[PDB]
Amino acid sequence: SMLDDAKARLRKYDIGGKYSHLPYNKYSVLLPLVAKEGKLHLLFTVRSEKLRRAPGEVCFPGGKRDPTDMDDAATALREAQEEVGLRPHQVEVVCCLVPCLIDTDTLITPFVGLIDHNFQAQPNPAEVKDVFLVPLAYFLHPQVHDQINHIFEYTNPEDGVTYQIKGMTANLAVLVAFIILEKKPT
């Protein structure tokens, strides 16, 4: 099946806990895969305009590890619940992708999660201004604007709203799309 095929592909790229004990300032992100209308989508947030870091930017759910977290995956799931109301029974964490090093002292660990079809986002407005889906296939043929660095513009055909997706968030989206969608019979 589509979902079994995605999980099988993803597992081949799982680094697991290899980098998890290293003494960094630690953050995790959840790359949430949603199946709608027979296709996979990624779920993104738009960060509230009131956050100090990166107000109004498109981001995956996630945040800083805290002492309660059993592991880095727990961080991602805790933060996703806080930001968009995703409950743990509503997500299957399939793998841990390559971590992202930033600022010389920070390591961001991305986890891919399969999201239950009955999940409906409840954006927490103190953290998230919007939640939206993008089809995973978009990231194979994105609409690129050069601001010099590359920015994706995605327009939701449901409402005509355009989102800008940049940086680590854009990079990770492409990676997930390659992993899951490369070399597939039609």
Which residues contact ligand H54 (rule: CB under 6 A)? 27, 29, 45, 47, 59-63, 83, 108, 127-128, 168-169
**Calpha distance 101→60 (Å, rounded):** 16
Task: Please state the closest distance from residue 57 (CB atom) to ligand H54, in A.
Answer: 9
Residue whose C-beta lies closest to ligand H54: 62
Mode of pairing for the β-strands spanning 25-36 and 62-64: antiparallel
Residue whose CB is less far from ligand H54, 60 or 152: 60
Taking the least distance from each CB to ligand H54, the nearer of 26 and 47 is 47
Tell the smallest beta-carbon distance from residue 4 to ligand H54 (Å).
27
Task: Tell me phi and psi for residue 166, to 5 degrees.
Answer: -140, 170
- Output the 3-class SS for 3-26: HHHHHHHHHCCCCCCCCCCCCCEE
Task: Pull the structure tokens for residue 50.
Answer: 């009131």
Nearer to ligand H54, 63 or 142 (CB): 63
Binding-site annotation: residue ranges for Mg(2+): 79, 83
Provide, rounded to whole angstroms, the least separation between the CB of residue 160 and ligand H54: 23
Which of residues 90 and 127 has its CB atom nearest to ligand H54 in the complex?
127
**CB of 142 vs ligand H54, minimal distance in Å:** 17
Distance CA 67, CA 38 (A): 39
Binding residues: 79, 83
CA dist 141 and 45 (Å) reads 21
152 and 165 Cβ atoms separated by less than 8 Å = yes
